[PDB]
Structures are given as structure tokens and as C-alpha cells.
Write a protein that binds this ligand. Sequence first.
Ligand code: THP
Ligand code: CA
Length: 129
Amino acid sequence: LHKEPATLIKAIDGDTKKLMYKGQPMTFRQLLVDTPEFNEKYGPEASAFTKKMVENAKKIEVEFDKGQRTDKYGRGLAYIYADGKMVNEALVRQGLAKVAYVYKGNNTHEQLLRKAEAQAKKEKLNIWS
Ligand SMILES: Cc1cn([C@H]2C[C@H](OP(=O)(O)O)[C@@H](COP(=O)(O)O)O2)c(=O)[nH]c1=O
Ligand SMILES: [Ca+2]
């Protein structure tokens, strides 16, 4: 897998955002995670977390996996990096997302994220509190 450039257009919520990629606006959905919706518990904290991470970043990058690059809603499916730090992993490490939606053929970073989840749980953080 390799990282590609993008720029932030707008934060949306814990696990989706609007990026410019290859010069075109797209909504991206983060691979392998599920944040609560804004109306759900820890939804607002997830949205805030993602928003800060991507708005403060000097450099946003997207990394597609080996499989499907867009979902059925037209959303890009990627791992998202903010100055080299994976947003998807950072959410899971903070107990603000669950590892989820692990489809075969698009799960290169599964074990990395599962390790983060285990530490969040040990710490009883947020969703695991
Ligand atoms: C994360 C991800 C979600 N999806 C689809 C599955 C879910 O379909 P349904 O909408 O039919 O439930 C939906 C979950 O995204 P959200 O958590 O953003 O709602 O997006 C994929 O198809 N591939 C993926 O990698
Ligand atoms: Ca969600």
C-alpha cells in the first residue's frame, strides 16, 4: 500500500470527511472502523477528535487498500493519515471507534487496529468505560 495526497475540504463526523483527491471533492469513509453517529454516545467526542486531527494537519494523505476503493454510496474507502499518523488507528486507540467492517481483501491494517483496540479496552477508555 502507498500514501497519496489529498486536502481537507470539511470535517463531517468521526469516521467520514470531505477531502479533495486527484482534484475532485469526495466523501471518504475510513476503513476498518466504526465511530458512533453524532446523535449517539461518544459521537460528539469522535467527531471532535477526527475534526481536530484533520484540521490541524499540515499534510493529509489517503491510502487505499487492495480491494474496493469506493463503497455503494460513492464514498472513498481509505486509511487516512494526518502528518503521518493514521486517524483510523488513533480513534480506535482512544476508544472512540470500534474495529468494524472488516471485509476480506480490504483488511491490510486489521491486526494493527485490533492491537490498538485491545489497549483502549485495557485502559477502559471512552466506549469501553
Ligand atoms: C466501512 C465500510 C462501510 N461500508 C458500508 C457498509 C454499511 O452499509 P449499510 O449502510 O447498508 O449499513 C455502511 C456502514 O457505514 P456507516 O457506519 O458510515 O453507516 O457502509 C462498506 O460497504 N465498506 C466499508 O469498508
Ligand atoms: Ca458510523
